[PDB]
């Protein structure tokens, strides 16, 4: 298996109309299986175990930034195939790589090998 992308990022919880970040910082990485299916997984840094694992089909979801709450790097994953969306925050000190990771995520979820 190969990891298309991987960067330190924590997940969040959006309920009703309020977004609350999770202190359980993890790692957002993408891996393509021999089935040519891109796997979107989120591993918690607390235990280093993969807490999330779901295959993302082409154009299934969109990875974008949410410039609504100024304070840090916040991104949101929206599933075009459905109406469910997730929120994440980068843990990288510098965004010099956050932007690339963001682009790569969209490339692996919208432009798989």
């Amino acid at each position: 298996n190969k990891y298309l992308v991987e960067f330190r990022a924590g997940k969040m919880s959006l309920k009703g109309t309020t977004v609350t970040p999770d202190k359980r910082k993890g790692l957002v990485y993408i891996q393509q299986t021999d089935d040519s299916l891109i796997h979107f997984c989120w591993k918690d840094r607390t235990s280093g175990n993969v807490e999330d694992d779901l295959i993302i089909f082409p154009d299934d979801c969109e990875f974008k930034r949410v410039p609504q709450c100024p304070s840090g790097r916040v991104y949101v994953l929206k599933f075009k195939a459905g109406s469910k969306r997730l929120f994440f925050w980068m843990q990288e000190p510098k965004t010099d790589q956050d932007e690339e990771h963001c682009r790569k995520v969209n490339e692996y979820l919208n432009n798989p090998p």
Binding site: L14, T17, V19, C69, S71, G72, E92, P93
Partner: peptide, 14 residues
């Protein structure tokens, strides 16, 4: 060293 986590905020599809 590492950046601190963000604080809770309201999100509205404007």
């Amino acid at each position: 060293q590492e950046p601190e986590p963000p604080e809770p905020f309201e999100y509205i599809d404007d």
